[PDB]
Amino acid sequence: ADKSDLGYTGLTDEQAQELHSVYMSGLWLFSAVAIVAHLAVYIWRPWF
Amino acid sequence: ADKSDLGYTGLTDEQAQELHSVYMSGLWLFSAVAIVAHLAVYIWRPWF
Amino acid sequence: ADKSDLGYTGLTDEQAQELHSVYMSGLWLFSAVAIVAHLAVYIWRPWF
Amino acid sequence: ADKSDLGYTGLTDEQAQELHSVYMSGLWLFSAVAIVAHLAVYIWRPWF
Amino acid sequence: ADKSDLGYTGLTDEQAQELHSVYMSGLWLFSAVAIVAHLAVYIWRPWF
Amino acid sequence: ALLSFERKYRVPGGTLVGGNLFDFWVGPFYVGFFGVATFFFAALGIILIAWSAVLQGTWNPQLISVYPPALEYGLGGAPLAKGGLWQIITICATGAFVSWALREVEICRKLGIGYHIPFAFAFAILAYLTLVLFRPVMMGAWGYAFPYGIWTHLDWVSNTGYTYGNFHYNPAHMIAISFFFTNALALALHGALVLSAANPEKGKEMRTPDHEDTFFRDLVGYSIGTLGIHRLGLLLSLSAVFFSALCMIITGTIWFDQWVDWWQWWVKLPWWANIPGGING
Amino acid sequence: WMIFDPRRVFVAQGVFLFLLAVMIHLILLSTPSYNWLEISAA
Amino acid sequence: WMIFDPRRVFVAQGVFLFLLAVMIHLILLSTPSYNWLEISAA
Amino acid sequence: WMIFDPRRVFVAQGVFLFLLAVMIHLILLSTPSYNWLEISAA
Amino acid sequence: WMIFDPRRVFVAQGVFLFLLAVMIHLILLSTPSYNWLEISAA
Amino acid sequence: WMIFDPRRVFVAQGVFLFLLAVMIHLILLSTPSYNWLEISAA
Amino acid sequence: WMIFDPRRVFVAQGVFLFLLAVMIHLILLSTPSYNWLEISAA
Amino acid sequence: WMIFDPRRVFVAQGVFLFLLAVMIHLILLSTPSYNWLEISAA
Amino acid sequence: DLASLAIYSFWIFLAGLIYYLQTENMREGYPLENEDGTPAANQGPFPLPKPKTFILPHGRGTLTVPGPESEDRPIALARTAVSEGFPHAPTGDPMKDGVGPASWVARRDLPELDGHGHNKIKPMKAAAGFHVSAGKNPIGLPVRGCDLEIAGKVVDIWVDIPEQMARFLEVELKDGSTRLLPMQMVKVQSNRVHVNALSSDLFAGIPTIKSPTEVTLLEEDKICGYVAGGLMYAAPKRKSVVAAMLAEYA
Amino acid sequence: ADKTIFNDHLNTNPKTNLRLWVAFQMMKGAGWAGGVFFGTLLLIGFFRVVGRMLPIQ
Numbered sequence A, B, C, D, E: 001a002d003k004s005d006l007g008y009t010g011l012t013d014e015q016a017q018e019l020h021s022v023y024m025s026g027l028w029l030f031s032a033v034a035i036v037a038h039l040a041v042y043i044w045r046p047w048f
Numbered sequence F: 001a002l003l004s005f006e007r008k009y010r011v012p013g014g015t016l017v018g019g020n021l022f023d024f025w026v027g028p029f030y031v032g033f034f035g036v037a038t039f040f041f042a043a044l045g046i047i048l049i050a051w052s053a054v055l056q057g058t059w060n061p062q063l064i065s066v067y068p069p070a071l072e073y074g075l076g077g078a079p080l081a082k083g084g085l086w087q088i089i090t091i092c093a094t095g096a097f098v099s100w101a102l103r104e105v106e107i108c109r110k111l112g113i114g115y116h117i118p119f120a121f122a123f124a125i126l127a128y129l130t131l132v133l134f135r136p137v138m139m140g141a142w143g144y145a146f147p148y149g150i151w152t153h154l155d156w157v158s159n160t161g162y163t164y165g166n167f168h169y170n171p172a173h174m175i176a177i178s179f180f181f182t183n184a185l186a187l188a189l190h191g192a193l194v195l196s197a198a199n200p201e202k203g204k205e206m207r208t209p210d211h212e213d214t215f216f217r218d219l220v221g222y223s224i225g226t227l228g229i230h231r232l233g234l235l236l237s238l239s240a241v242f243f244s245a246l247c248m249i250i251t252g253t254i255w256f257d258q259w260v261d262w263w264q265w266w267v268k269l270p271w272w273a274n275i276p277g278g279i280n281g
Numbered sequence G, H, I, J, K, L, M: 001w002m003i004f005d006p007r008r009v010f011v012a013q014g015v016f017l018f019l020l021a022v023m024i025h026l027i028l029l030s031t032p033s034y035n036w037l038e039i040s041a042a
Numbered sequence N: 001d002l003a004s005l006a007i008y009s010f011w012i013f014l015a016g017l018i019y020y021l022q023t024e025n026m027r028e029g030y031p032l033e034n035e036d037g038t039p040a041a042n043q044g045p046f047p048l049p050k051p052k053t054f055i056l057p058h059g060r061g062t063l064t065v066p067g068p069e070s071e072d073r074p075i076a077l078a079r080t081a082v083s084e085g086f087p088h089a090p091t092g093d094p095m096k097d098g099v100g101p102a103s104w105v106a107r108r109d110l111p112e113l114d115g116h117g118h119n120k121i122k123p124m125k126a127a128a129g130f131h132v133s134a135g136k137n138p139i140g141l142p143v144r145g146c147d148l149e150i151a152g153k154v155v156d157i158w159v160d161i162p163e164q165m166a167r168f169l170e171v172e173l174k175d176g177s178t179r180l181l182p183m184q185m186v187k188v189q190s191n192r193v194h195v196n197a198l199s200s201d202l203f204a205g206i207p208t209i210k211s212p213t214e215v216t217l218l219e220e221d222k223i224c225g226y227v228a229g230g231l232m233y234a235a236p237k238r239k240s241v242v243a244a245m246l247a248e249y250a
Numbered sequence O: 001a002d003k004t005i006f007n008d009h010l011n012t013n014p015k016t017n018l019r020l021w022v023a024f025q026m027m028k029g030a031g032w033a034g035g036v037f038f039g040t041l042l043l044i045g046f047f048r049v050v051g052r053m054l055p056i057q
């Protein structure tokens, strides 16, 4: 079933129960897994 | 409330459906799975 | 909430809804994640 | 059902159809069946 | 002399109205003083 | 087995989210959620005294050695018995330090005794870490570490402990000793501050905390009470370690030189600068 | 009777054998003369 | 549910394969006579 | 739901990070002068 | 009016900049004299 | 709440600027590039 | 408000400078390039 | 009280006679003459 | 003496010092009893010693210790597992039968005595020693329970002399029927108090101290134990409590 | 307002998530911060974040 407004859907507040666990925490721990890797990659070994 | 006799809990009929289907099945789903897997373990590599 | 039978819980037929997607295909595609990798590590370069 | 005094628990037949029915599984699969492992042992290899 | 009025603390909401203003609004009398004296050190003496 | 009053205290829970799946009382011991964890950690760990007993040499924990990696291999691994197999022992050790101090909470939340105990082992968690993690990650490789033994890391601390001249010139070290000899300074009178009142000499009526205030005010001029010397045991016994993990978090990684050469930063002062005085003069 | 069936009969066998098998492997790996990858290094 | 699905095997098996992954990274990436990426100098 | 949850970001973003990581692998694993895993014999 | 607001407005800006930026990344990767770690080579 | 003001926060405006000003001025008072103080010698 | 006035404005403001003035003059007493009084010969 | 019974023989006495056995063996298995295990060839 | 002598008067005279010491710490508590009132499994390799005579500080009798060990006080746990090992659960609500996280004991009716001839713990309206007579002085402010709601008003202090300390914080109810509450859990910051143990509609379940000035050693068991009762269960399961009971720092 | 079973609500527009939640609970998460998640962040996180263009030669 769909509603009316924005986002609806949405689906307020299915916009803050499913865009939070895997959208934020999925991409924030895709930023807590990617940034860290670089810190063994930036200098080993592009400098040669 | 807790009862009395043999034995609780429980739970007749569950002497041959609970303590024989996930209890005596272990004497098979691995005890014999050992006997077949050991045909590829017992000879690797005690003989050099 | 809980039943009495077996698995119950269970919980038929969630014993085959929550132990089919992540359990069966769980140890199946992990047999395609861990095993297919073996075929490029057996010899490169344990053979030295 | 709660108890009070010596020497419950105990007691019966929570001792008869239970404690008699599980302890011999630890006092036979390791008492006389442990002398069935003595098979490939008593001759291999005390005598060289 | 702090942020607002009698009494503090304070406050409810608070925290959403205390630690967002001591680094930006308490720094609106400093960050604007910082904006100017940084453009001159975009050339002297980063490059010697 | 359980005690006589251990009747009312028996209640399931304590563990977090999942249930009472792991909390079965095996004997006098507690096997909570971190109970079977330490069962997993203590079973593999006895083998780690026996592994490099066929790779390094001897089979007796007298000279058994799984050495730390070398100094320069980088941010990575090692050989094996000389680092690689050493690299596996720690996360069990520490993985077992952790599964113990935090299986206490499955008893702390289980009843209602305080959470200042997942903590007094965390100065032991922050005292064994400073020799396995805090040091050898930065100066080159995991080669800056001690051996696990009981006679190997002995001839590693002395005849191999004068790299910095003498370590007594190390001020916090010596303050983390101005903190350590004071532990049994206040266990020696507090372990005897409850002993001799029901057993005075034999027969006499028992003392109360007013005789405590005519024995210790009749001692050393300071009587902070009886709750001032359990704030005077947990003040003797946790901190000789952060003044030693600070005697070494700036020793070797910044000062791998003589700490006997540190006590010439004190004689340098504009007032008595160009002046040789005594002994020095 | 008693013990468990819906609680502790599928888990007293999972990490229990992992506490008796996969950490038993470390004995047949404490070898480097046998070993299924350290035979060549002898 | 016999086993616990969103408990024992959703964040407790992801580290159970993480259990046997990196401890062996300090054996096979180790070994005193292998490497095959480190000794690019000798 | 603004976007699709069990459709566009449970495996479709799993081929979004996967579509990036490996197409560059054969640029960084490659290169005529980096390697540090191939050139260890010659 | 028309078009899509609960559909093709969060999916016309997710595979459109990725089809104008990340595919554009390849031409500034087509440099190996510039390039953000090839400077060591040239 | 959970952040003092009559005791804690008063010292975080008067001398926080005093510190993070001169504390960064510390290491740049005798250096072989920027200078701009001890240049006054010729 | 909040913090005390006659303990940070009258005399305690005077030690915001009393030792804050003697410190900067305890660095340049054994210094030649300035001095400006240590020698008064000619 | 003082001395009970039905717990010592299950997990303690089995490792009391064994404890009474263990500190005896590694000397008579290693005496200048006895041993009786390793030697059976010559 | 010699190079090989003195290490033997030690592998022996002290090899039983974990043995002699353990029993001296295994006085109280032992013997071991089962889950009903029964001569239990055993004691251990360091069994409990037969006690010596204990003289008490204010003539409280021939209380030898280990002393009373039987089942005097009421206990109410419905035995879930009749087998010894698996835990037990209370009857109705666990904070009424007194079983689990909230513990107490039945003692003799003589409160803790000092040596002056008077009792140990008294309010500020039982010791005119230190008072209020300068500026504005805070002994009378509102409070808050774990439910995150006002609980009462505390306007007094139970004084101490030998330790110069405090043990309770007395609450003036709307009525006056006495109540009590411990001392170390507390966490006060500004102008209102916050306790994070019991909800603000479970404070009357805390016994009225038979006297508002006296604490008999009999009473001083549940009175500092009911808060521990709310440190285990509290609180299933969803919403506000998850943002209250968990997390935090201190 | 109340379900009787415990001490919260299902949904309803007003009253619920109105001025609770982000008001009282995790108010310590920020007040404690500005010194712990800001003070241990001046010579370590910056120690490895500049490496990006400079060591590339």
Ligand code: BCL
Pocket (backbone or CB within 6 Å): F168, F174, F175, F177, F178, F179, F180, F181, F182, F185
């Ligand atoms: C057995 C071989 C040596 C020796 C081996 C060692 C070793 C090893 C150590 C010392 C240490 C010390 N030794 Mg010694 N020491 C000996 C036996 C003694 C005897 C004695 C025979 O009765 C005395 C009185 C001392 C005296 C002392 C202390 C001054 C000092 C730290 C004690 C401490 O922390 O306790 C705390 C309780 C106290 C009452 C002491 C507090 C007194 C003041 C505060 C400490 C003065 C030290 C110094 C000046 C610090 C400045 C003080 C500041 C004003 C706070 N030693 C013999 C002669 N000793 C430790 C040390 O720090 O080296 C100097 C150290 O690691």
Ligand code: BCL
Pocket (backbone or CB within 6 Å): F097, F123, F124, F125, F127, F128, F130, F156, F157, F158, F161, F162, F166, F167, F168, F172, F173, F174, F176, F177, F180, F181, F240, F241, F243, F244, F245, F247, F248
């Ligand atoms: C050259 C000789 C030097 C010197 C050589 C060294 C060296 C080397 C070191 C020190 C270190 C220290 N020295 Mg010094 N030291 C000297 C002599 C002394 C004397 C003395 C009076 O003689 C004293 C009192 C000290 C005191 C100190 C401390 C400042 C510091 C201790 C840190 C520590 O151990 O915490 C650490 C706490 C722990 C490791 C406990 C952790 C507990 C863990 C979590 C649990 C383990 C469980 C276990 C595995 C299981 C076993 C139990 C079984 C189940 C039965 N040194 C002389 C001056 N000293 C150490 C240091 O400063 O670095 C921190 C150090 O490395």
Ligand SMILES: CC[C@H]1c2cc3[nH]c4c(c3C)C(=O)[C@H](C(=O)OC)c4c3nc(cc4[nH]c(cc(n2)[C@@H]1C)c(C(C)=O)c4C)[C@@H](C)[C@@H]3CCC(=O)OC/C=C(\C)CCC[C@H](C)CCC[C@H](C)CCCC(C)C
Pocket (backbone or CB within 6 Å): F038, F039, F041, F042, F043, F044, F045, F046, F048, F089, F092, F093, F096, F097, F100, F101, F120, F121, F123, F124, F127, F148, F149, F150, F237, F238, F239, F241
């Ligand atoms: C400043 C902190 C001080 C401290 C405090 C402290 N230690 C504590 C505790 C506290 C509060 C406990 O509560 C806990 C305890 O049980 O009380 C004694 C403990 C403890 N302190 C212990 C030892 C210990 N503490 C030490 C030091 C200190 N403890 C500090 C002085 C030291 C020394 C002398 O450095 C030792 C040897 C244990 C008896 C006990 C920790 C109990 C525990 O956590 O067990 C978990 C371990 C396993 C499950 C085994 C698995 C590990 C692997 C299988 C093998 C480990 C390899 C490793 C190299 C072991 C080698 C040991 C030695 C050869 C070095």
Ligand SMILES: CC[C@H]1c2cc3[nH]c4c(c3C)C(=O)[C@H](C(=O)OC)c4c3nc(cc4[nH]c(cc(n2)[C@@H]1C)c(C(C)=O)c4C)[C@@H](C)[C@@H]3CCC(=O)OC/C=C(\C)CCC[C@H](C)CCC[C@H](C)CCCC(C)C
Pocket (backbone or CB within 6 Å): F181, F182, F183, F184, F185, F186, F188, F189, F219, F220
């Ligand atoms: C079991 C071993 C542990 C231990 C036990 C122990 N220490 C003990 C004792 C015990 C049982 C005491 O009974 C005794 C004590 O009373 O404790 C407070 C003591 C003690 N251990 C102390 C220190 C100490 N503890 C140590 C360590 C240890 N002691 C171990 C941890 C050490 C070491 C490591 O060597 C030292 C040095 C003291 C605190 C105390 C000893 C009390 C004493 O003998 O002092 C006598 C009093 C004086 C000498 C007064 C003179 C003061 C100055 C010498 C003169 C200058 C000041 C004067 C005021 C001039 C100013 C003029 C004025 C007139 C105005």
Ligand SMILES: [Fe+2]
Pocket (backbone or CB within 6 Å): F190, F191, F193, F194
């Ligand atoms: Fe004590």
